[PDB]
């Protein structure tokens, strides 16, 4: 599994990657077969095109801002969680503030992404 520093980077570059909307760029991150929970508390969704769907949804149709709001919290077994705050329109400006909970695999790709964060997490 990545190591701590490893998965500092790739859960910085998913967080650029959501900042420009690069879709099939975001899609690349995760495993062929992954899971997205967001928000978490609902259904996974499963496997890459599921995925590809799900983010050109939520991302296109618009600009959308992404930054981390703290550093990355690592873990040696391939896990790490992270802050950042969503900005879009929906639909004025608001922001969303999310914690984003990942598991990679062996090959360096998203197994299992959970974003935590409810309505009371928005702000217009």
């Known amino acids: 599994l990545p190591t701590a520093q490893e998965v500092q980077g790739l859960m910085a570059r998913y967080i ?3 900042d420009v909307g690069d879709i099939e760029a ?3 991150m995760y495993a062929d077969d ?5 928000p ?6 499963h496997g ?26 690592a873990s040696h077994n391939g896990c790490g969680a992270m802050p ?11 922001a ?8 990679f695999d062996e090959h360096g790709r998203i197994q299992t992404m959970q974003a935590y964060w ?3 997490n928005l702000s217009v």
């Open 26 to 28: 975001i899609v690349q």
């Open 48 to 73: 890459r095109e599921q995925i590809a769907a799900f983010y050109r949804q939520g991302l296109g149709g618009g600009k959308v801002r992404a930054c981390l709001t703290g550093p990355v919290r």
């Open 34 to 38: 992954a899971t997205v929970e967001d």
């Open 84 to 94: 950042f705050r969503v900005e879009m329109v929906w639909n004025q400006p608001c």
């Open 16 to 18: 650029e990657l959501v």
């Open 118 to 120: 409810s309505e009371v």
């Open 96 to 103: 969303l503030d999310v914690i984003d909970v990942a598991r």
């Open 40 to 45: 978490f508390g609902q259904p996974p969704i």
